[PDB]
Design a binder for this molecule. Structure first.
Ligand SMILES: *[C@@H]1O[C@H](CO)[C@@H](O)[C@H](O)[C@H]1NC(C)=O
Ligand SMILES: *[C@@H]1O[C@H](CO)[C@@H](O)[C@H](O)[C@H]1NC(C)=O
Ligand SMILES: *[C@H]1O[C@H](CO)[C@@H](O)[C@H](O)[C@@H]1O
Ligand SMILES: *[C@H]1O[C@H](CO)[C@@H](O)[C@H](O)[C@@H]1O
Ligand SMILES: *[C@H]1O[C@H](CO)[C@@H](O)[C@H](O)[C@@H]1O
Ligand SMILES: *[C@H]1O[C@H](CO)[C@@H](O)[C@H](O)[C@@H]1O
Ligand SMILES: *[C@H]1O[C@H](CO)[C@@H](O)[C@H](O)[C@@H]1O
Ligand SMILES: *[C@H]1O[C@H](CO)[C@@H](O)[C@H](O)[C@@H]1O
Ligand SMILES: *[C@H]1O[C@H](CO)[C@@H](O)[C@H](O)[C@@H]1O
Ligand SMILES: *[C@H]1O[C@H](CO)[C@@H](O)[C@H](O)[C@@H]1O
Ligand SMILES: *[C@H]1O[C@H](CO)[C@@H](O)[C@H](O)[C@@H]1O
Ligand SMILES: *[C@H]1O[C@H](CO)[C@@H](O)[C@H](O)[C@@H]1O
Ligand SMILES: *[C@H]1O[C@H](CO)[C@@H](O)[C@H](O)[C@@H]1O
Ligand SMILES: *[C@H]1O[C@H](CO)[C@@H](O)[C@H](O)[C@@H]1O
Ligand SMILES: *[C@H]1O[C@H](CO)[C@@H](O)[C@H](O)[C@@H]1O
Ligand SMILES: *[C@H]1O[C@H](CO)[C@@H](O)[C@H](O)[C@@H]1O
Ligand SMILES: *[C@H]1O[C@H](CO)[C@@H](O)[C@H](O)[C@@H]1O
Ligand SMILES: [Cu+2]
Length: 248
């Protein structure tokens, strides 16, 4: 259980959507994170993998502004509370909004995977991407590909928790969506997968007992786009300035 508090893009801090705070406010701010109904810091289960909730979390509605970034920039995700409690993989996707992300229909977004880390070593439980996130003060770093075509994209970051995944419907997915506007020199525009086609309840990395050794792990979802590292070097860094979500 947790949620993202902020993202830091080359040192520039943005307030994320806070489902533990904003729903209680009269007039919550416009932010780069989508509005969602994870007030309990909870998850989407496999029985909702074919439901709109898996796209950007429960009942999600579009963030009403965006963060402008350059292709090649790195984005740090800050999860709270510290520490994240569960073992599992971490993945990141982009989907072109084909227009403003503030008004895109989320059910049309076709996600391509830009990073994904699973089981790093061992078993029962082993060391996972989540352990790296915990070590780095509850952060994960993704790089927007240097050659990504200019456009507006939803960035879908997700931790999957596997401590209860040995049973049907036991995996727990924690997607978090953000609006970005990307500038750059490249033309990369990878083939994506609809959110409700990403995962199935019987996938080998979804229905899995991690309390066994030796252990292997197939990260769910499509391949990381060719030519991208499956992760860039992890490590937390501080923000040096703050910005607000830019409205169209
Ligand atoms: C999501 O929306 C549905 C439809 O209105 C509602 O019944 C449900 O309570 C909402 N979920 C949460 C967690 O608020
Ligand atoms: C670790 O991250 C949490 C959540 O953002 C923050 O409250 C805390 O100050 C961070 N630790 C340091 C040393 O910055
Ligand atoms: C510090 O470094 C991290 C890792 O590159 C960035 O994500 C962050 O925005 C800041 O520049
Ligand atoms: C490009 O590749 C993706 C899978 O990675 C497909 O979902 C898409 O239809 C296209 O063939
Ligand atoms: C996944 O499921 C959704 C319905 O929840 C469809 O809109 C989508 O095309 C895909 O089949
Ligand atoms: C797990 O197995 C089911 C069939 O039992 C498939 O539909 C699913 O795509 C996954 O391969
Ligand atoms: C638990 O399951 C793993 C397979 O993931 C085996 O390698 C191990 O021997 C035990 O049966
Ligand atoms: C889990 O434990 C098994 C015991 O055989 C090891 O082989 C494996 O490398 C992992 O540590
Ligand atoms: C991941 O990589 C495979 C092979 O390059 C593609 O077919 C897929 O569409 C995704 O980019
Ligand atoms: C995947 O495909 C790309 C594009 O051809 C290569 O750059 C990469 O080395 C891998 O074969
Ligand atoms: C992403 O995945 C690849 C292939 O499993 C690793 O080699 C890389 O270090 C990262 O974990
Ligand atoms: C991306 O990050 C993962 C987790 O630290 C590493 O295992 C990988 O080699 C790459 O640096
Ligand atoms: C990651 O951790 C560092 C401290 O090591 C913080 O400065 C940063 O804000 C993030 O929480
Ligand atoms: C604060 O300073 C850092 C390091 O100079 C920058 O990365 C950031 O964009 C802001 O200017
Ligand atoms: C801008 O303000 C944010 C919070 O609004 C900080 O976290 C950041 O360090 C900078 O002072
Ligand atoms: C940019 O705009 C947002 C929304 O009004 C503020 O939360 C932020 O402090 C800055 O003024
Ligand atoms: C939204 O986009 C504007 C540029 O159009 C930036 O100035 C702002 O910091 C935010 O990223
Ligand atoms: Cu939890």
């Amino acid at each position: 259980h947790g949620h993202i508090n902020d993202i830091v893009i080359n040192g520039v801090w943005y307030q994320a959507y806070d489902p533990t705070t904003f729903p209680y406010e009269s007039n919550p701010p416009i932010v780069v994170g989508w509005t969602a109904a994870d007030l309990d810091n909870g998850f989407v289960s496999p029985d909702a993998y074919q439901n709109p909730d898996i796209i950007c979390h429960k009942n999600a509605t579009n963030a009403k502004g965006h963060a402008s970034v350059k292709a090649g920039d790195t984005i740090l995700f800050q999860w709270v509370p510290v520490p994240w409690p569960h073992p599992g993989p971490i993945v990141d996707y982009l989907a072109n909004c084909n227009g403003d992300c503030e008004t895109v229909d989320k059910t049309t977004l076709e996600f391509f995977k830009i990073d994904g880390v699973g089981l790093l070593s061992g078993g029962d439980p082993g060391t996972w991407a989540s352990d790296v996130l915990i070590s780095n003060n509850n952060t994960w770093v993704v790089k927007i590909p240097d050659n990504l075509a200019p456009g507006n994209y939803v960035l879908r970051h997700e931790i999957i928790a596997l401590h209860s995944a040995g049973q049907a419907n036991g995996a727990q997915n924690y997607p978090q969506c953000f609006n970005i506007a990307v500038s750059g020199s490249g033309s990369l525009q990878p083939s994506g997968v609809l959110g409700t086609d990403l995962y199935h309840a019987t996938d080998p990395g979804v229905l899995i007992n991690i309390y066994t050794s030796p252990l292997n792990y197939i990260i769910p979802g499509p391949t990381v786009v060719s030519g991208l590292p499956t992760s860039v070097a992890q490590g937390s860094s501080a923000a040096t300035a703050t910005a607000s979500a830019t409205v169209p």
